[PDB]
Protein backbone atom coordinates (compact mmCIF):
# COMPACT_ATOMS: atom_id res chain seq x y z
CA UNK A 1 0.00 0.00 0.00
CA UNK A 2 0.99 3.65 -0.23
CA UNK A 3 2.20 5.28 2.98
CA UNK A 4 -0.22 8.12 3.83
CA UNK A 5 -3.31 5.96 3.40
CA UNK A 6 -1.84 2.89 5.03
CA UNK A 7 -1.23 5.40 7.85
CA UNK A 8 -4.86 6.51 8.16
CA UNK A 9 -5.95 2.87 7.95
CA UNK A 10 -3.76 1.88 10.93
CA UNK A 11 -4.94 4.89 12.95
CA UNK A 12 -8.64 4.21 12.30
CA UNK A 13 -8.20 0.51 13.10
CA UNK A 14 -5.90 1.15 16.09
CA UNK A 15 -3.43 -1.58 15.11
CA UNK A 16 0.00 0.10 15.58
CA UNK A 17 1.00 -2.43 18.27
CA UNK A 18 0.19 -5.38 15.98
CA UNK A 19 2.12 -3.89 13.04
CA UNK A 20 5.11 -3.21 15.29
CA UNK A 21 5.06 -6.74 16.75
CA UNK A 22 5.09 -8.24 13.24
CA UNK A 23 8.30 -6.30 12.55
CA UNK A 24 9.82 -7.64 15.78
CA UNK A 25 8.88 -11.21 14.81
CA UNK A 26 10.36 -10.93 11.29
CA UNK A 27 13.59 -9.14 12.28
CA UNK A 28 16.97 -10.74 11.64
CA UNK A 29 18.86 -12.58 14.38
CA UNK A 30 22.65 -12.80 14.00
CA UNK A 31 25.35 -13.62 16.56
CA UNK A 32 26.91 -10.97 18.85
CA UNK A 33 29.63 -13.10 20.44
CA UNK A 34 32.30 -10.40 20.78
CA UNK A 35 29.85 -8.11 22.65
CA UNK A 36 29.15 -10.83 25.24
CA UNK A 37 32.75 -11.72 26.15
CA UNK A 38 33.35 -11.03 29.88
CA UNK A 39 36.14 -8.51 29.22
CA UNK A 40 33.58 -6.25 27.45
CA UNK A 41 30.92 -6.05 30.16
CA UNK A 42 31.83 -2.48 31.16
CA UNK A 43 31.79 -1.45 27.46
CA UNK A 44 28.03 -2.05 27.13
CA UNK A 45 25.37 0.20 28.64
CA UNK A 46 22.54 -2.34 28.37
CA UNK A 47 22.90 -6.11 28.44
CA UNK A 48 20.14 -6.60 25.83
CA UNK A 49 21.50 -4.14 23.19
CA UNK A 50 24.52 -5.50 21.35
CA UNK A 51 26.09 -5.05 17.89
CA UNK A 52 26.06 -8.06 15.56
CA UNK A 53 29.51 -9.51 14.85
CA UNK A 54 29.17 -9.18 11.07
CA UNK A 55 28.53 -5.42 11.11
CA UNK A 56 30.31 -4.15 14.25
CA UNK A 57 32.84 -1.31 14.10
CA UNK A 58 36.33 -2.46 15.07
CA UNK A 59 38.76 -0.14 16.81
CA UNK A 60 42.27 -0.15 15.29
CA UNK A 61 43.84 -1.56 18.42
CA UNK A 62 45.35 -4.97 19.06
CA UNK A 63 44.52 -5.26 22.77
CA UNK A 64 40.74 -4.85 22.58
CA UNK A 65 39.00 -3.75 19.40
CA UNK A 66 35.45 -3.69 20.81
CA UNK A 67 32.95 -0.82 20.85
CA UNK A 68 29.14 -1.01 20.93
CA UNK A 69 28.66 0.42 17.43
CA UNK A 70 27.30 -0.91 14.10
CA UNK A 71 27.69 0.03 10.40
CA UNK A 72 24.30 0.34 8.70
CA UNK A 73 25.04 0.21 4.90
CA UNK A 74 22.03 1.08 2.68
CA UNK A 75 22.89 -0.11 -0.84
CA UNK A 76 20.08 1.33 -3.01
CA UNK A 77 19.98 4.66 -1.18
CA UNK A 78 23.81 4.91 -1.18
CA UNK A 79 23.95 6.08 2.44
CA UNK A 80 25.91 4.67 5.35
CA UNK A 81 25.50 5.39 9.08
CA UNK A 82 27.29 4.31 12.26
CA UNK A 83 24.78 3.77 15.10
CA UNK A 84 26.23 3.63 18.62
CA UNK A 85 25.29 3.93 22.29
CA UNK A 86 25.84 7.08 24.31
CA UNK A 87 29.44 6.91 25.54
CA UNK A 88 30.18 5.58 29.03
CA UNK A 89 32.77 7.04 31.46
CA UNK A 90 35.17 4.26 30.40
CA UNK A 91 34.46 4.48 26.62
CA UNK A 92 34.67 8.21 25.81
CA UNK A 93 38.20 7.70 24.48
CA UNK A 94 37.08 4.75 22.31
CA UNK A 95 34.25 6.88 20.94
CA UNK A 96 36.57 9.60 19.65
CA UNK A 97 39.04 6.99 18.39
CA UNK A 98 36.20 5.59 16.23
CA UNK A 99 35.27 9.05 14.94
CA UNK A 100 38.91 9.58 13.95
CA UNK A 101 39.57 6.14 12.41
CA UNK A 102 36.32 6.10 10.41
CA UNK A 103 36.87 9.67 9.00
CA UNK A 104 33.44 10.87 10.11
CA UNK A 105 32.64 14.58 9.72
CA UNK A 106 29.54 14.75 11.93
CA UNK A 107 28.17 13.43 15.24
CA UNK A 108 24.37 13.41 15.74
CA UNK A 109 23.14 13.35 19.38
CA UNK A 110 19.44 12.80 20.07
CA UNK A 111 19.30 12.77 23.90
CA UNK A 112 20.20 15.04 26.83
CA UNK A 113 22.99 14.02 29.22
CA UNK A 114 20.38 13.79 31.99
CA UNK A 115 16.80 12.64 31.38
CA UNK A 116 14.19 11.43 33.89
CA UNK A 117 16.63 12.32 36.71
CA UNK A 118 19.30 9.81 35.55
CA UNK A 119 22.44 9.98 33.44
CA UNK A 120 21.90 8.76 29.84
CA UNK A 121 25.46 9.33 28.62
CA UNK A 122 28.78 10.84 29.69
CA UNK A 123 29.66 14.50 29.17
CA UNK A 124 31.98 13.58 26.29
CA UNK A 125 32.69 17.03 24.72
CA UNK A 126 34.05 20.26 26.24
CA UNK A 127 31.67 23.00 27.30
CA UNK A 128 34.14 25.95 27.30
CA UNK A 129 36.66 27.03 24.64
CA UNK A 130 39.49 27.42 27.15
CA UNK A 131 38.93 23.96 28.84
CA UNK A 132 39.88 21.34 26.29
CA UNK A 133 39.71 17.56 26.88
CA UNK A 134 42.53 15.05 26.60
CA UNK A 135 41.82 11.31 26.22
CA UNK A 136 45.04 9.67 27.37
CA UNK A 137 44.08 6.05 26.64
CA UNK A 138 43.67 6.84 22.89
CA UNK A 139 45.98 9.91 22.56
CA UNK A 140 43.43 12.46 21.29
CA UNK A 141 42.70 16.10 22.12
CA UNK A 142 39.28 17.72 21.69
CA UNK A 143 38.53 21.48 21.70
CA UNK A 144 35.33 23.50 21.50
CA UNK A 145 35.67 26.05 18.67
CA UNK A 146 32.15 27.57 18.57
CA UNK A 147 28.58 26.87 19.65
CA UNK A 148 25.27 28.00 18.15
CA UNK A 149 22.24 27.44 20.44
CA UNK A 150 18.78 27.44 18.84
CA UNK A 151 15.33 26.68 20.18
CA UNK A 152 15.21 22.97 19.28
CA UNK A 153 18.88 22.07 18.72
CA UNK A 154 22.48 23.22 19.12
CA UNK A 155 25.34 22.95 16.58
CA UNK A 156 28.93 22.94 17.78
CA UNK A 157 32.22 23.12 15.91
CA UNK A 158 34.92 20.94 17.47
CA UNK A 159 38.60 20.29 16.69
CA UNK A 160 39.94 16.75 17.10
CA UNK A 161 43.71 16.32 17.15
CA UNK A 162 45.56 13.02 16.86
CA UNK A 163 48.37 13.74 19.32
CA UNK A 164 50.53 10.95 17.84
CA UNK A 165 50.71 12.59 14.36
CA UNK A 166 49.63 16.18 15.20
CA UNK A 167 46.98 15.97 12.45
CA UNK A 168 43.78 17.91 13.14
CA UNK A 169 40.20 17.71 11.85
CA UNK A 170 37.00 19.72 12.21
CA UNK A 171 34.03 17.70 13.59
CA UNK A 172 30.43 19.05 13.59
CA UNK A 173 28.25 18.17 16.63
CA UNK A 174 24.51 18.27 15.89
CA UNK A 175 22.58 18.05 19.17
CA UNK A 176 18.79 17.70 19.16
CA UNK A 177 17.84 18.94 22.63
CA UNK A 178 14.01 18.84 22.74
CA UNK A 179 12.94 15.19 22.42
CA UNK A 180 10.48 14.72 25.35
CA UNK A 181 11.43 12.59 28.38
CA UNK A 182 8.37 10.37 27.67
CA UNK A 183 6.79 9.51 24.32
CA UNK A 184 7.58 11.17 20.97
CA UNK A 185 7.17 14.72 19.65
CA UNK A 186 3.64 15.81 18.74
CA UNK A 187 4.76 17.29 15.38
CA UNK A 188 7.71 16.08 13.26
CA UNK A 189 8.45 19.60 12.05
CA UNK A 190 11.45 20.38 14.29
CA UNK A 191 12.94 16.88 13.82
CA UNK A 192 12.74 17.29 10.02
CA UNK A 193 14.27 20.78 10.21
CA UNK A 194 17.10 19.19 12.24
CA UNK A 195 17.62 16.42 9.66
CA UNK A 196 17.84 18.99 6.85
CA UNK A 197 20.46 20.97 8.82
CA UNK A 198 22.60 17.83 9.19
CA UNK A 199 22.21 17.16 5.45
CA UNK A 200 23.20 20.72 4.46
CA UNK A 201 26.46 20.46 6.44
CA UNK A 202 27.87 17.72 4.19
CA UNK A 203 28.07 15.27 7.12
CA UNK A 204 25.93 12.64 5.35
CA UNK A 205 27.74 12.82 2.02
CA UNK A 206 30.01 10.24 0.33
CA UNK A 207 33.11 12.48 0.47
CA UNK A 208 33.27 11.76 4.23
CA UNK A 209 33.19 8.66 6.43
CA UNK A 210 29.80 7.66 7.88
CA UNK A 211 28.01 9.98 10.26
CA UNK A 212 28.03 8.74 13.89
CA UNK A 213 24.50 8.87 15.43
CA UNK A 214 23.56 8.05 19.02
CA UNK A 215 20.94 8.29 21.71
CA UNK A 216 21.14 6.40 25.00
CA UNK A 217 21.00 2.84 23.59
CA UNK A 218 21.58 3.75 19.94
CA UNK A 219 18.46 1.99 18.53
CA UNK A 220 15.31 4.02 19.25
CA UNK A 221 15.61 7.74 18.43
CA UNK A 222 18.73 6.86 16.41
CA UNK A 223 16.70 4.40 14.35
CA UNK A 224 14.07 7.04 13.69
CA UNK A 225 16.73 9.42 12.33
CA UNK A 226 18.30 7.06 9.78
CA UNK A 227 14.97 5.44 8.77
CA UNK A 228 13.45 8.85 7.93
CA UNK A 229 16.57 10.00 6.06
CA UNK A 230 16.85 6.83 3.92
CA UNK A 231 13.14 6.72 3.04
CA UNK A 232 13.07 10.36 1.90
CA UNK A 233 16.21 9.81 -0.21
CA UNK A 234 14.66 6.76 -1.91
CA UNK A 235 11.51 8.79 -2.71
CA UNK A 236 13.74 11.25 -4.60
CA UNK A 237 15.64 8.55 -6.50
CA UNK A 238 12.81 6.29 -7.75
CA UNK A 239 10.43 6.79 -10.67
CA UNK A 240 7.52 5.86 -8.39
CA UNK A 241 7.91 7.42 -4.91
CA UNK A 242 4.79 5.64 -3.61
CA UNK A 243 6.72 2.36 -3.98
CA UNK A 244 8.80 3.16 -0.88
CA UNK A 245 7.76 0.71 1.85
CA UNK A 246 8.87 1.98 5.25
CA UNK A 247 8.44 -1.40 6.98
CA UNK A 248 10.69 -3.09 4.39
CA UNK A 249 13.34 -0.39 4.77
CA UNK A 250 13.26 -0.86 8.55
CA UNK A 251 13.64 -4.64 8.25
CA UNK A 252 16.62 -4.09 5.90
CA UNK A 253 18.27 -1.77 8.51
CA UNK A 254 17.63 -4.38 11.23
CA UNK A 255 19.93 -6.77 9.34
CA UNK A 256 22.76 -4.48 10.59
CA UNK A 257 21.71 -3.58 14.17
CA UNK A 258 19.10 -5.11 16.45
CA UNK A 259 16.11 -3.30 17.89
CA UNK A 260 15.89 -0.24 15.65
CA UNK A 261 12.67 1.59 16.60
CA UNK A 262 11.82 0.67 20.18
CA UNK A 263 8.05 1.32 20.45
CA UNK A 264 4.92 1.46 18.29
CA UNK A 265 4.79 5.21 18.99
CA UNK A 266 8.26 5.60 17.46
CA UNK A 267 7.08 3.60 14.43
CA UNK A 268 4.07 5.89 13.99
CA UNK A 269 6.25 8.97 14.43
CA UNK A 270 8.58 7.69 11.68
CA UNK A 271 5.63 7.38 9.27
CA UNK A 272 4.51 10.90 10.20
CA UNK A 273 7.99 12.33 9.59
CA UNK A 274 8.40 10.72 6.16
CA UNK A 275 4.89 11.73 5.07
CA UNK A 276 5.31 15.38 6.02
CA UNK A 277 8.84 15.54 4.74
CA UNK A 278 7.85 14.26 1.31
CA UNK A 279 5.62 17.33 0.84
CA UNK A 280 8.29 19.84 1.75
CA UNK A 281 10.85 18.29 -0.57
CA UNK A 282 8.79 19.30 -3.59
CA UNK A 283 5.33 20.76 -3.16
O1 LIG B 1 31.29 0.09 34.16
C1 LIG B 1 30.18 -0.47 33.78
C2 LIG B 1 29.65 -1.53 34.45
C3 LIG B 1 28.52 -2.09 34.00
C4 LIG B 1 27.86 -1.64 32.91
C5 LIG B 1 26.62 -2.29 32.46
N1 LIG B 1 26.87 -3.62 31.87
C6 LIG B 1 25.57 -4.36 31.46
C7 LIG B 1 25.79 -5.79 31.10
C8 LIG B 1 25.60 -6.82 31.91
C9 LIG B 1 25.88 -8.02 31.32
C10 LIG B 1 26.32 -7.86 30.08
S1 LIG B 1 26.32 -6.29 29.66
C11 LIG B 1 28.43 -0.63 32.24
C12 LIG B 1 29.54 -0.04 32.62
From Swiss-Prot:
Where is it chiefly localized? endoplasmic reticulum
Q: What class of enzyme is it?
A: hydrolase
Positions bound to substrate: 181, 215-221, 262
Mod. after translation: Oxidized on Cys-215; the Cys-SOH formed in response to redox signaling reacts with the alpha-amido of the following residue to form a sulfenamide cross-link, triggering a conformational change that inhibits substrate binding and activity. The active site can be restored by reduction.
Q: Which residues carry this modification: Cysteine persulfide?
A: 215
- Tell me which residues bear Cysteine sulfinic acid (-SO2H): 215
What's its job? Tyrosine-protein phosphatase which acts as a regulator of endoplasmic reticulum unfolded protein response. Mediates dephosphorylation of EIF2AK3/PERK; inactivating the protein kinase activity of EIF2AK3/PERK. May play an important role in CKII- and p60c-src-induced signal transduction cascades. May regulate the EFNA5-EPHA3 signaling pathway which modulates cell reorganization and cell-cell repulsion. May also regulate the hepatocyte growth factor receptor signaling pathway through dephosphorylation of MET.
Q: What is the protein's name according to its record?
A: Tyrosine-protein phosphatase non-receptor type 1
Amino acid sequence: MEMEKEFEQIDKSGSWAAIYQDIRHEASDFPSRVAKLPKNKNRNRYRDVSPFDHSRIKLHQEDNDYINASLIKMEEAQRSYILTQGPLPNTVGHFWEMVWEQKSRGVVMLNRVMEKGSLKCAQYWPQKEEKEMIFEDTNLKLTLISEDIKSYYTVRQLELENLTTQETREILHFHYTTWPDFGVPESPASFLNFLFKVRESGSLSPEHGPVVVHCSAGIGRSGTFCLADTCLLLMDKRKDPSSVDIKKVLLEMRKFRMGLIQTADQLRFSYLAVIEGAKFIMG
